[PDB]
Design a binder for this molecule. Sequence first.
Ligand SMILES: [K+]
Ligand SMILES: [K+]
Ligand SMILES: [K+]
Ligand SMILES: [K+]
Ligand SMILES: [K+]
Ligand SMILES: [K+]
Ligand SMILES: [K+]
Ligand SMILES: [K+]
Ligand SMILES: [K+]
Ligand SMILES: [K+]
Ligand SMILES: [K+]
Ligand SMILES: [K+]
Ligand SMILES: [K+]
Ligand SMILES: [K+]
Ligand SMILES: [K+]
Ligand SMILES: [K+]
Ligand SMILES: [K+]
Ligand SMILES: [K+]
Ligand SMILES: [K+]
Ligand SMILES: [K+]
Ligand SMILES: [K+]
Ligand SMILES: [K+]
Ligand SMILES: [K+]
Ligand SMILES: [K+]
Ligand SMILES: [K+]
Ligand SMILES: [K+]
Ligand SMILES: [K+]
Ligand SMILES: [K+]
Ligand SMILES: [K+]
Ligand SMILES: [K+]
Ligand SMILES: [K+]
Ligand SMILES: [K+]
Ligand SMILES: [K+]
Ligand SMILES: [K+]
Ligand SMILES: [K+]
Ligand SMILES: [K+]
Ligand SMILES: [K+]
Ligand SMILES: [K+]
Ligand SMILES: [K+]
Ligand SMILES: [K+]
Ligand SMILES: [K+]
Ligand SMILES: [K+]
Ligand SMILES: [K+]
Ligand SMILES: [K+]
Ligand SMILES: [K+]
Ligand SMILES: [K+]
Ligand SMILES: [K+]
Ligand SMILES: [K+]
Ligand SMILES: [K+]
Ligand SMILES: [K+]
Ligand SMILES: [K+]
Ligand SMILES: [K+]
Ligand SMILES: [K+]
Ligand SMILES: [K+]
Ligand SMILES: [K+]
Ligand SMILES: [K+]
Ligand SMILES: [Mg+2]
Ligand SMILES: [Mg+2]
Ligand SMILES: [Mg+2]
Ligand SMILES: [Mg+2]
Ligand SMILES: [Mg+2]
Ligand SMILES: [Mg+2]
Ligand SMILES: [Mg+2]
Ligand SMILES: [Mg+2]
Ligand SMILES: [Mg+2]
Ligand SMILES: [Mg+2]
Ligand SMILES: [Mg+2]
Ligand SMILES: [Mg+2]
Ligand SMILES: [Mg+2]
Ligand SMILES: [Mg+2]
Ligand SMILES: [Mg+2]
Ligand SMILES: [Mg+2]
Ligand SMILES: [Mg+2]
Ligand SMILES: [Mg+2]
Ligand SMILES: [Mg+2]
Ligand SMILES: [Mg+2]
Ligand SMILES: [Mg+2]
Ligand SMILES: [Mg+2]
Ligand SMILES: [Mg+2]
Ligand SMILES: [Mg+2]
Ligand SMILES: [Mg+2]
Ligand SMILES: [Mg+2]
Ligand SMILES: [Mg+2]
Ligand SMILES: [Mg+2]
Ligand SMILES: [Mg+2]
Ligand SMILES: [Mg+2]
Ligand SMILES: [Mg+2]
Ligand SMILES: [Mg+2]
Ligand SMILES: [Mg+2]
Ligand SMILES: [Mg+2]
Ligand SMILES: [Mg+2]
Ligand SMILES: [Mg+2]
Ligand SMILES: [Mg+2]
Ligand SMILES: [Mg+2]
Ligand SMILES: [Mg+2]
Ligand SMILES: [Mg+2]
Ligand SMILES: [Mg+2]
Ligand SMILES: [Mg+2]
Ligand SMILES: [Mg+2]
Ligand SMILES: [Mg+2]
Ligand SMILES: [Mg+2]
Ligand SMILES: [Mg+2]
Ligand SMILES: [Mg+2]
Ligand SMILES: [Mg+2]
Ligand SMILES: [Mg+2]
Ligand SMILES: [Mg+2]
Ligand SMILES: [Mg+2]
Ligand SMILES: [Mg+2]
Ligand SMILES: [Mg+2]
Ligand SMILES: [Mg+2]
Ligand SMILES: [Mg+2]
Ligand SMILES: [Mg+2]
Ligand SMILES: [Mg+2]
Ligand SMILES: [Mg+2]
Ligand SMILES: [Mg+2]
Ligand SMILES: [Mg+2]
Ligand SMILES: [Mg+2]
Ligand SMILES: [Mg+2]
Ligand SMILES: [Mg+2]
Ligand SMILES: [Mg+2]
Ligand SMILES: [Mg+2]
Ligand SMILES: [Mg+2]
Ligand SMILES: [Mg+2]
Ligand SMILES: [Mg+2]
Ligand SMILES: [Mg+2]
Ligand SMILES: [Mg+2]
Lengths: 97, 118, 154
Amino acid sequence: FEGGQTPLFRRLPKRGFTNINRKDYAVVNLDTLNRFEDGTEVTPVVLKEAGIVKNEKAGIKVLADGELTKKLTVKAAKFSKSAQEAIEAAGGSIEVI
Amino acid sequence: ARVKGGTVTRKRRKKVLKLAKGYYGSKHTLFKSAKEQVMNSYYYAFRDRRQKKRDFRKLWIARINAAARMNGLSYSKLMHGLKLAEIDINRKMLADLAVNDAAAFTALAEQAKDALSK
Amino acid sequence: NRSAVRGGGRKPWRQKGTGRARQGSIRSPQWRGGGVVFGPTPRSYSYKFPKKVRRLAMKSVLSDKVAENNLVAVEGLSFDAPKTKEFKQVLANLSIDTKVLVVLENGNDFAALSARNLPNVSVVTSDNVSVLDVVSANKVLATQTALTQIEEVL
RNA sequence: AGAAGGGAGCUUGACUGCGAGACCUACAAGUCGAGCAGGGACGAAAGUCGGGCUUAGUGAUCCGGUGGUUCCGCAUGGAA
RNA sequence: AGGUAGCGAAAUUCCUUGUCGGGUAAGUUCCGACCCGCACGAAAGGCGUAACGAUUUGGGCACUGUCUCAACGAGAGACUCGGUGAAAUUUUAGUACCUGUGAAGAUGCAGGUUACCCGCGACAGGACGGAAAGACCCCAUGGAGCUUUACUGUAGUUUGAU
RNA sequence: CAAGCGACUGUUUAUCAAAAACACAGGUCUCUGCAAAAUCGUAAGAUGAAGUAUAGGGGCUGACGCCUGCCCGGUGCUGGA
RNA sequence: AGGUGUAGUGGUAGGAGAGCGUUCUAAGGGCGUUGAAGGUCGAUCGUGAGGACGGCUGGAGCGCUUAGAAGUGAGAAUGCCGGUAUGAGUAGCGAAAGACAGGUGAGAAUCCUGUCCACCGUAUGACUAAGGUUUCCUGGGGAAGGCUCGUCCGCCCAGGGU
RNA sequence: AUAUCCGGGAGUCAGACUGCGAGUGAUAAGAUCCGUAGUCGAAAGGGAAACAGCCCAGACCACCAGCUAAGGUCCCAAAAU
RNA sequence: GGUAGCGGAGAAAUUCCAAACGAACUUGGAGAUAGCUGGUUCUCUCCGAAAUAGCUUUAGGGCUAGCCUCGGAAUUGAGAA
RNA sequence: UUAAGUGAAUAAGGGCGCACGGUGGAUGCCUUGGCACUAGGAGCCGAUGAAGGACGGGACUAACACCGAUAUGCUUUGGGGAGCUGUAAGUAAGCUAUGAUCCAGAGAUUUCCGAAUGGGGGAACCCAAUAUCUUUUAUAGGAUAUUACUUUUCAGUGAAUACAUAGCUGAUUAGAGGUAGACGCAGAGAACUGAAACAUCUUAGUACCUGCAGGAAGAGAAAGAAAAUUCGAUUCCCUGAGUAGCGGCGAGCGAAACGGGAAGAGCCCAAACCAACAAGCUUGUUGGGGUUGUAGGACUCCGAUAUGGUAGUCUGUUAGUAUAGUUGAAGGAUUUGGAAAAUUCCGCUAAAGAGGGUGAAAGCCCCGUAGACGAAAUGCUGACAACACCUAGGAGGAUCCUGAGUACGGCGGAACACGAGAAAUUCCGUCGGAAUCCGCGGGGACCAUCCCGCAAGGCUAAAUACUCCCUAGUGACCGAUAGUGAACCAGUACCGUGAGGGAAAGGUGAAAAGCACCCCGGAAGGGGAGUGAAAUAGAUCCUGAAACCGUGUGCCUACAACAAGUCAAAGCUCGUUAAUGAGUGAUGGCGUGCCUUUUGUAGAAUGAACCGGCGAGUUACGAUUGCAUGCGAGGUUAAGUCGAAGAGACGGAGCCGCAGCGAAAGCGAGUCUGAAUAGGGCGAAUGAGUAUGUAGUCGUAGACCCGAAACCAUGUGAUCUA
Ligand SMILES: [K+]
Ligand SMILES: [K+]
Ligand SMILES: [K+]
Ligand SMILES: [K+]
Ligand SMILES: [K+]
Ligand SMILES: [K+]
Ligand SMILES: [K+]
Ligand SMILES: [K+]
Ligand SMILES: [K+]
Ligand SMILES: [K+]
Ligand SMILES: [K+]
Ligand SMILES: [K+]
Ligand SMILES: [K+]
Ligand SMILES: [K+]
Ligand SMILES: [K+]
Ligand SMILES: [K+]
Ligand SMILES: [K+]
Ligand SMILES: [K+]
Ligand SMILES: [K+]
Ligand SMILES: [K+]
Ligand SMILES: [K+]
Ligand SMILES: [K+]
Ligand SMILES: [K+]
Ligand SMILES: [K+]
Ligand SMILES: [K+]
Ligand SMILES: [K+]
Ligand SMILES: [K+]
Ligand SMILES: [K+]
Ligand SMILES: [K+]
Ligand SMILES: [K+]
Ligand SMILES: [K+]
Ligand SMILES: [K+]
Ligand SMILES: [K+]
Ligand SMILES: [K+]
Ligand SMILES: [K+]
Ligand SMILES: [K+]
Ligand SMILES: [K+]
Ligand SMILES: [K+]
Ligand SMILES: [K+]
Ligand SMILES: [K+]
Ligand SMILES: [K+]
Ligand SMILES: [K+]
Ligand SMILES: [K+]
Ligand SMILES: [K+]
Ligand SMILES: [K+]
Ligand SMILES: [K+]
Ligand SMILES: [K+]
Ligand SMILES: [K+]
Ligand SMILES: [K+]
Ligand SMILES: [K+]
Ligand SMILES: [K+]
Ligand SMILES: [K+]
Ligand SMILES: [K+]
Ligand SMILES: [K+]
Ligand SMILES: [K+]
Ligand SMILES: [K+]
Ligand SMILES: [Mg+2]
Ligand SMILES: [Mg+2]
Ligand SMILES: [Mg+2]
Ligand SMILES: [Mg+2]
Ligand SMILES: [Mg+2]
Ligand SMILES: [Mg+2]
Ligand SMILES: [Mg+2]
Ligand SMILES: [Mg+2]
Ligand SMILES: [Mg+2]
Ligand SMILES: [Mg+2]
Ligand SMILES: [Mg+2]
Ligand SMILES: [Mg+2]
Ligand SMILES: [Mg+2]
Ligand SMILES: [Mg+2]
Ligand SMILES: [Mg+2]
Ligand SMILES: [Mg+2]
Ligand SMILES: [Mg+2]
Ligand SMILES: [Mg+2]
Ligand SMILES: [Mg+2]
Ligand SMILES: [Mg+2]
Ligand SMILES: [Mg+2]
Ligand SMILES: [Mg+2]
Ligand SMILES: [Mg+2]
Ligand SMILES: [Mg+2]
Ligand SMILES: [Mg+2]
Ligand SMILES: [Mg+2]
Ligand SMILES: [Mg+2]
Ligand SMILES: [Mg+2]
Ligand SMILES: [Mg+2]
Ligand SMILES: [Mg+2]
Ligand SMILES: [Mg+2]
Ligand SMILES: [Mg+2]
Ligand SMILES: [Mg+2]
Ligand SMILES: [Mg+2]
Ligand SMILES: [Mg+2]
Ligand SMILES: [Mg+2]
Ligand SMILES: [Mg+2]
Ligand SMILES: [Mg+2]
Ligand SMILES: [Mg+2]
Ligand SMILES: [Mg+2]
Ligand SMILES: [Mg+2]
Ligand SMILES: [Mg+2]
Ligand SMILES: [Mg+2]
Ligand SMILES: [Mg+2]
Ligand SMILES: [Mg+2]
Ligand SMILES: [Mg+2]
Ligand SMILES: [Mg+2]
Ligand SMILES: [Mg+2]
Ligand SMILES: [Mg+2]
Ligand SMILES: [Mg+2]
Ligand SMILES: [Mg+2]
Ligand SMILES: [Mg+2]
Ligand SMILES: [Mg+2]
Ligand SMILES: [Mg+2]
Ligand SMILES: [Mg+2]
Ligand SMILES: [Mg+2]
Ligand SMILES: [Mg+2]
Ligand SMILES: [Mg+2]
Ligand SMILES: [Mg+2]
Ligand SMILES: [Mg+2]
Ligand SMILES: [Mg+2]
Ligand SMILES: [Mg+2]
Ligand SMILES: [Mg+2]
Ligand SMILES: [Mg+2]
Ligand SMILES: [Mg+2]
Ligand SMILES: [Mg+2]
Ligand SMILES: [Mg+2]
Ligand SMILES: [Mg+2]
Ligand SMILES: [Mg+2]
Ligand SMILES: [Mg+2]
């Protein structure tokens, strides 16, 4: 309350809408995948047991923030293009579930 | 738990009343009157510890002035002359000599008069 | 509070003209017999530390007893029938005269019965042992199986 | 008046995306802006042009109208 | 559609104690009259009116302590004594005057002046005395009652369809 | 003796106003054909009336005497449609 | 742990910091009929809130240390309740006639008796409805009630009465 | 020897007088309204007789010690008749 | 005996309805709301304002900023004279 | 001698200090009673007369408690073992080992009023009818029973009116009122308030009123939730989430599903069809049959009369359990004292060292406690038995059935978090109004497709809510101004016409041993003498503060203008927590209270008569910051289960953090804008979080405390007055 001056929120427009079908993915970066040994099968189940991803939301999405250094066969709902290149550049492989 | 008033209230007021012993009527009897007068007494006592220093210097100077004139000199000229003679005796001591040891006060006065002439 | 105290609905006297202080109820808090302002209200005082903190606290008191050599482990405490004098003699056998927490394995009814009446003894079972239990005792007297059970619990 | 005043030709920059940095300022706002790109006007070129000598000519949000839209579309395709 | 009859300085006339006449030694009131009716007027009736009125208003006779102007007497209280015994109020008070000062009107501050201690009967100038959280005044995006061609509703009434 | 106001007897602000205020008989307007209009009530049921237009309701005026002029554009009411 | 040096140390609203005291809880360690708490007095200690120690009173409980929790601190609210003042021995003691003798009694202007006097008498008499609800009668009483008093009472006690 | 910046907690939104510079006012007001400095507010002490706002000056405390500020030195009343 | 509070009754005065009636009394919603007035209880230490701007159905209220306080970060030291 | 000068003492009264009293009832200690809860019990009582009352009952009886004309008790069955006739003494008269009083189970009695109910009525009163009995010669008198109203069923009478029906009489049957000031469902439904005004909105579907309940209620067995592909009645808890949404898009309002738990349970009808009966080929009654969505059933075929289940019954039997009880270890001295439990000395008991009482503080004195044990009677529960009641498989579709004035629609309202909105879903009023298995409904306007279901019929335990009462306990809850209004004869006294409002008031002592007797006094009251450890513990009785009132007197005071103190100070009087002491104080200097509110108050502004007690930032849930601890790219569980109303364990559902950018599709250490490899915004680069504690502040709540005028909703009043 501003003592009767039109409050800041009334001065500003409402914006946007919420998508009923909105899908939000649980983000996993490459530096987090360095925690698994070479040849590991990294899975949403494996990540849940590791405690890395407690809530996968609409699914696991892998992002290329850090540098990956181990060879893995990574399974996830989505892959950023850079993350796919890094995983395969490390001699691993990706699979969309 | 519940904390009832207890004895702290009475203890505190009794201390104030003790400070008010000898005050007139209700001022030594009733806590509110006694507390108000004890506060005023504190205000006076602090102020008067400064004033007593003024009052005694006023007394000594007046007594030194009377003794100075009995030696052919005013107070102000005597203190100028004593300063010229490098005498550091203070007014409490001078007033005491003025009353109790007049011969010594005269000897001081002569030194001051000598210093004034020089 | 003023709403819970009996009566007091009506205004004691008119707002103006009587020369009295204005009052809205005979149960107002400054009245004798009026409602209490604030004051106690029923509530819980319990809260839960993180589990890891609970575990560390329990190990600390147990490790403190050992560090001071106040943990007296006995092979077993057997009694054909519960008799306080006998357990009292066991405490003398082990030279325990101070407050002691006697920690017994489950099912040792007769040792618990014979120990509990002694004013300086506190009895627990190995699976119900709390930090307050341990800290209160100057000494802990634990049977061998009780110690093993504790180590399985923790 | 090295015009910002006056006349004439061609024009539509009274451009689109913007914008380092400043001024002003409780906030919300208000003001100036080099420069970059797109596509231009005038000019031989330099260059000037994001209205007018400068500073007034204005009104938040909510709610509605109209136009556009590679956005969403409550099982799905549509629609609303 | 422009106020007629009647009345009119009026329970209405501001100017206003209008003006003139009467009444008085002297009449801002009263009565009679005049009519520039600020701003009378015919059923929110006009004008008049015998009788009536604890009605308003002016004059007169009688009468008087109303007054000139106050005096005396009776009783009740007051006063003294015996009995009985409240109240409002109250920061503590050993509680003067003048001039000044100061939140601009001080028993209390300054300067000066006056004043032995304690009461009793009296009086009210002050204690901005007591009584009541000013009623006037303003304010509160207070309250209540009232009004309407304020807003929004609504009981009722009415009209149509079913 | 005289003037204002109210015709009159009455009535009223229990507790600051008894009056020139209210009422009044009289006047006038208007509604009401009876399951009247009007009013109390969601209704049933009542009052109006066990009355019936010379009666009942409502508005205004206010004994009596003499009188009560002009305006229907406006607003209401009534009728028309 | 302290020491030196320089500087600083008025303060409303208000911010920060650090403490005093109250009741209760836990643990520890203690004190109490050889006198706890509380009360009261004293010339006591600390920079402050406050803390001891003695005497007296008192007659059962209560400190201390550390930590915890709080209905945790009053001088003001025309605060609430209680007590007691001030005004005061003051206002008032509620429309009127009583006097004296004798009696009763611890005590009588005030109770009883007598005498005269005085007051009401379309009443202050005699009935009765309501209302009250034991106030009626008799014998005792004098704390309170009675505006004084009281031996008396519409009061109190004990009996009775329609 | 402070400045910014980030964050927790406020309080304040009646100001007053004095000097100086202006307006309003009658170049009246202890008036009103700004600017500017100070004091009061929230500041005790000394001086101005008394006297929030003027002059001197900022009280952590003790002293029966000294020096000064404004202002003073014939008596009240300290100090040069 | 009848009429009862969104009411009754009123020869009409805001008149009466159990000693205050522009709308009774009682209990409840209920600790109504109160930008208003009053009150708000131990101590010492450190620091210490404001009475201004902007906006406000706003003017004795509020909000952001200014001014106070506490903590923190950091720089070629950015403050003051 | 004279003159001039100086000059004490004195107090009518007053002041200060001190001592001792009175008044008063603070304080301390204590407690009869309260407050908040936990576990279990029980969750209703009434026409077989309730709740609540009135009036009565005792050797004397005013009150309370008990009881009811069988009255301070009766019978009976158990328990119990020496006293008893309540509070309450006193006298009196009695009872009890042939078992009293007392305790528990079961019965008897139970006046009058009150729903009240034969009629009436101003409750606790009055007045009847009929039958039987009784009193009197008889009338009068007395006793017992029956007699309200409506409902259900049956019978009998019986109108207008023919048969009938209505009415009427009787019988039968069942309701009628009260609560527990709670909890549930439903009808009806405010206002102050918030929105800084206010009509939408909010307060709220709250308060109030009314109906119906039940021990719980309600809901409940998919015309569901969904679209991970699936789940499989309902209820409740955690979470989702202050999210999606709603909203003068304001103030505010605010889900649901999924996930995790508690608890779990399912079943009966209508219709088709069959059979029987009755009636006017159908058209009713009864019984069978049948019960649904991977459609079921009828029907027609075959085939088994089994096997399982139960939310049945005063069916017994049995066990347990509630309602009385029994038993239950161990100390003596010594010191102090009135008294020992304190103390000292040696002992002992403990399945009991919980607690209470006892002449102070007791494991061993008492009541108890741990433990063991006990039931004639009546409940309650569980089994077991009995009995009753339900329970068929498979294959066929020709035909038949599967809830109509219903679904649904228009209009007007309401409920859904959802305010008509694009508004689905549910309901109410009004009008219109389907299909029916090749059908119908839902998946948030609507259509198609797909998927999920099968309305218009009913019932149903548990998990949930609440506590007037009962039993056993608990408390960093109260300790008489508190705690219930009420510790005490309190919903009383008292106030009010009434509704209604509503107090004050606890403490002798270990024991009354409550002061024989004497003395003054009419008494009251004192003084002795006694009792007692103490009476200055004497009933107004523990402690006994202050205001206030008084007595004694060390110092001062009758020339002085004084917020009354302070600083300086003679004199006098005293001697300490022994301190460069105490009280008083002539005289001198200085000096306008406290608080609030103000630019500024000694203020001639406010508040306080005084003293004492009480009296105001709290708690819960959330937000956020500081501090602290644990763990750390991680941190952490919630409900719940076990457990002492504890810690703890389990529980990973969920929540925060680890990735941002965008309205969004979406991309991602980037992303959005843009044509843009540009620029710019926000981010990353350039990492610290999270749980809990603690404190500061805020938000929702009365939110620091007190105060309006008023508003609304039930009631109470015309004994005043119109
Ligand atoms: K041109
Ligand atoms: K005229
Ligand atoms: K006129
Ligand atoms: K004349
Ligand atoms: K007249
Ligand atoms: K008259
Ligand atoms: K006379
Ligand atoms: K003043
Ligand atoms: K006077
Ligand atoms: K009013
Ligand atoms: K009249
Ligand atoms: K008349
Ligand atoms: K007339
Ligand atoms: K009259
Ligand atoms: K009238
Ligand atoms: K006429
Ligand atoms: K008429
Ligand atoms: K008219
Ligand atoms: K008439
Ligand atoms: K007209
Ligand atoms: K017309
Ligand atoms: K003492
Ligand atoms: K408090
Ligand atoms: K007070
Ligand atoms: K008095
Ligand atoms: K007095
Ligand atoms: K008598
Ligand atoms: K100035
Ligand atoms: K300053
Ligand atoms: K009247
Ligand atoms: K800050
Ligand atoms: K004297
Ligand atoms: K009855
Ligand atoms: K209840
Ligand atoms: K409203
Ligand atoms: K408001
Ligand atoms: K049910
Ligand atoms: K939420
Ligand atoms: K709004
Ligand atoms: K069947
Ligand atoms: K004991
Ligand atoms: K049994
Ligand atoms: K809808
Ligand atoms: K659906
Ligand atoms: K479905
Ligand atoms: K005593
Ligand atoms: K004295
Ligand atoms: K003095
Ligand atoms: K005043
Ligand atoms: K960028
Ligand atoms: K870009
Ligand atoms: K941390
Ligand atoms: K925190
Ligand atoms: K509050
Ligand atoms: K708060
Ligand atoms: K009446
Ligand atoms: Mg107190
Ligand atoms: Mg209340
Ligand atoms: Mg008063
Ligand atoms: Mg209370
Ligand atoms: Mg779709
Ligand atoms: Mg859809
Ligand atoms: Mg004239
Ligand atoms: Mg004359
Ligand atoms: Mg004339
Ligand atoms: Mg007229
Ligand atoms: Mg007319
Ligand atoms: Mg007339
Ligand atoms: Mg007298
Ligand atoms: Mg002046
Ligand atoms: Mg003056
Ligand atoms: Mg003075
Ligand atoms: Mg002065
Ligand atoms: Mg006055
Ligand atoms: Mg006022
Ligand atoms: Mg008249
Ligand atoms: Mg008359
Ligand atoms: Mg009157
Ligand atoms: Mg009169
Ligand atoms: Mg008239
Ligand atoms: Mg200083
Ligand atoms: Mg205590
Ligand atoms: Mg308190
Ligand atoms: Mg007080
Ligand atoms: Mg007097
Ligand atoms: Mg008299
Ligand atoms: Mg006579
Ligand atoms: Mg007569
Ligand atoms: Mg008599
Ligand atoms: Mg008698
Ligand atoms: Mg008397
Ligand atoms: Mg001024
Ligand atoms: Mg101020
Ligand atoms: Mg000063
Ligand atoms: Mg001041
Ligand atoms: Mg001098
Ligand atoms: Mg000279
Ligand atoms: Mg009027
Ligand atoms: Mg009245
Ligand atoms: Mg409310
Ligand atoms: Mg400072
Ligand atoms: Mg505005
Ligand atoms: Mg039941
Ligand atoms: Mg027996
Ligand atoms: Mg009857
Ligand atoms: Mg509002
Ligand atoms: Mg025993
Ligand atoms: Mg012993
Ligand atoms: Mg809604
Ligand atoms: Mg539908
Ligand atoms: Mg419909
Ligand atoms: Mg299906
Ligand atoms: Mg159930
Ligand atoms: Mg009480
Ligand atoms: Mg007490
Ligand atoms: Mg009480
Ligand atoms: Mg004593
Ligand atoms: Mg006593
Ligand atoms: Mg003199
Ligand atoms: Mg003298
Ligand atoms: Mg002022
Ligand atoms: Mg004052
Ligand atoms: Mg004064
Ligand atoms: Mg006062
Ligand atoms: Mg009534
Ligand atoms: Mg009546």
